[PDB]
Design an enzyme around this catalytic site. Structure first.
Site, mmCIF file in Angstrom:
data_model
loop_
_atom_site.group_PDB
_atom_site.id
_atom_site.type_symbol
_atom_site.label_atom_id
_atom_site.label_comp_id
_atom_site.label_asym_id
_atom_site.label_seq_id
_atom_site.Cartn_x
_atom_site.Cartn_y
_atom_site.Cartn_z
ATOM 1 C CD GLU A 14 -3.218 0.368 0.167
ATOM 2 O OE1 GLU A 14 -4.414 0.054 -0.005
ATOM 3 O OE2 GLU A 14 -2.725 1.432 -0.266
ATOM 4 C CG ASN B 275 -8.634 3.004 0.522
ATOM 5 O OD1 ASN B 275 -7.410 3.092 0.632
ATOM 6 N ND2 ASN B 275 -9.292 1.869 0.727
ATOM 7 C CG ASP C 109 -7.193 -0.057 -1.854
ATOM 8 O OD1 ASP C 109 -6.879 0.968 -1.217
ATOM 9 O OD2 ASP C 109 -6.883 -1.207 -1.477
ATOM 10 C CD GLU D 80 -10.462 -5.041 6.722
ATOM 11 O OE1 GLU D 80 -11.124 -5.483 5.757
ATOM 12 O OE2 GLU D 80 -9.284 -5.390 6.950
ATOM 13 N NE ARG E 210 -5.046 -1.118 8.859
ATOM 14 C CZ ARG E 210 -5.028 -0.652 7.618
ATOM 15 N NH1 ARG E 210 -4.610 0.574 7.346
ATOM 16 N NH2 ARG E 210 -5.422 -1.441 6.622
ATOM 17 C CG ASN F 214 -6.207 2.583 4.614
ATOM 18 O OD1 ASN F 214 -5.384 1.669 4.689
ATOM 19 N ND2 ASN F 214 -7.165 2.608 3.694
HETATM 20 O O1 LIG Z 1 -7.495 -3.175 4.805
HETATM 21 C C1 LIG Z 1 -7.343 -2.736 3.455
HETATM 22 C C2 LIG Z 1 -6.889 -1.273 3.420
HETATM 23 O O2 LIG Z 1 -5.610 -1.132 4.037
HETATM 24 C C3 LIG Z 1 -6.800 -0.826 1.960
HETATM 25 O O3 LIG Z 1 -6.363 0.531 1.917
HETATM 26 O O4 LIG Z 1 -8.078 -0.934 1.330
HETATM 27 C C4 LIG Z 1 -8.460 -2.309 1.289
HETATM 28 C C5 LIG Z 1 -8.681 -2.824 2.714
HETATM 29 O O5 LIG Z 1 -9.148 -4.174 2.684
HETATM 30 FE FE LIG Z 2 -5.759 1.743 0.453
#
Ligand SMILES: O[C@@H]1[C@@H](O)[C@H](O)OC[C@H]1O
Ligand SMILES: [Fe+2]
Ligand SMILES: O[C@@H]1[C@@H](O)[C@@H](O)OC[C@H]1O
Ligand SMILES: O[C@@H]1[C@@H](O)[C@H](O)OC[C@H]1O
Length: 286
Positions: A14, A142, A192, A116, A95, A97
């Site tokens: 990520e 996100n 995402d 989640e 947390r 992201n």
């Molecule tokens: O936990 C994951 C998160 O970190 C990501 O940014 O998006 C998908 C999620 O499942």
């Molecule tokens: Fe993400």
């Protein structure tokens, strides 16, 4: 065909950024910060004391602002991690992201329920005046990003499969929230991470969608890149001309049969594109 430049097999790759003419990113669930040099193929990794979710460079090479489950920290390879600020109560089991840095040096970052399930995550703006809560009640935030002209801001509710657009004023406030794009077709396709390129187009990586989509500023899909990896997490423009589009991917949530069919899942991929991205900005802490 898309090329995998690093068969990393990350659990949750990520937050890729292009900094110092190299690619920096994280493996959230393996608690790793990775650095990749495209000119030589050399790779470096640093261990994190908890899940590390984003990286944003600070002006003057004074380290990165990183998101640990325990709070927002500074990370420097020669000093480790030092707490900058707790943003939420640990009892929420939240947390951080995704994150981005706008043209004024502000750090926009989101939080999420680590389980989640709860709508306990928020959007935050960290600048010289401090940390302000810009949105709330989002289970998985996100892809915060701004347009090259700085007037539009994008943010994603992943589990709701929605990307919203805001008006962004120079003072840094958001207004006129509206749905930018809603994903309907695809039971296990979730948006995402996202970035905006130099032309104002939105690149969105698809969780469970085997690639990424390019959207016009009007919200119409114009291009789709496919990868040999079911879960693509975030794109990042890099390379000498900012025309090499990298992608992080994840093995998290994939069955053993799917991983056997797509063994490159969790790797870093790269594709040349026709439109350059935006240069990476650095966080202003002083
Ligand atoms: O936990 C994951 C998160 O970190 C990501 O940014 O998006 C998908 C999620 O499942
Ligand atoms: Fe993400
Ligand atoms: O730019 C810096 C990088 O070179 C490394 O030292 O990690 C800290 C960053 O601030
Ligand atoms: O793609 C495969 C790779 O993931 C594995 O590690 O080595 C064998 C390759 O065929």
């Amino acid at each position: 065909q898309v090329t995998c430049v690093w068969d990393l097999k990350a659990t949750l790759g990520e937050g890729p950024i292009w900094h110092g003419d190299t690619l920096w990113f994280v493996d959230i669930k393996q608690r790793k910060i990775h650095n990749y040099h495209p000119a030589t193929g050399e790779r470096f990794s640093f261990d994190a004391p908890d899940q590390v979710t984003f990286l944003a460079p600070i002006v003057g090479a004074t380290g990165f602002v990183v998101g640990l489950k325990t709070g927002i920290h500074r990370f420097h390879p020669a000093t480790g991690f030092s707490l900058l600020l707790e943003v939420e109560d640990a009892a929420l089991n939240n947390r951080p992201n995704d994150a981005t840095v706008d043209a004024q040096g502000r750090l926009w970052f989101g939080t999420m329920h680590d389980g989640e399930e709860n709508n306990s995550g928020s959007l935050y703006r960290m600048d010289l005046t401090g940390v302000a809560r810009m949105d709330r009640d989002i289970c998985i935030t996100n892809g915060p990003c701004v347009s090259p002209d700085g007037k539009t801001f994008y943010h994603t509710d992943t589990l709701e499969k929605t990307i919203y657009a805001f008006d962004l004023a120079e003072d840094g406030l958001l207004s006129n929230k509206r749905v930018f794009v809603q994903f309907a077709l695809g039971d296990d396709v979730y948006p995402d991470g996202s970035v905006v390129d130099s032309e104002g187009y939105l690149w969105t990586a698809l969780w469970g969608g085997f690639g990424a989509v390019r959207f016009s500023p009007q919200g119409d899909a114009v291009t789709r890149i496919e990868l040999p990896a079911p879960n693509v997490t975030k794109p990042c423009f890099g390379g000498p001309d900012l025309k090499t589009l990298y992608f992080t991917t994840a093995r998290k949530g994939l069955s053993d049969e799917t991983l056997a069919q797509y063994p490159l899942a969790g790797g870093v991929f790269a594709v040349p594109v026709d439109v350059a991205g935006q240069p990476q900005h650095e966080v202003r802490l002083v």
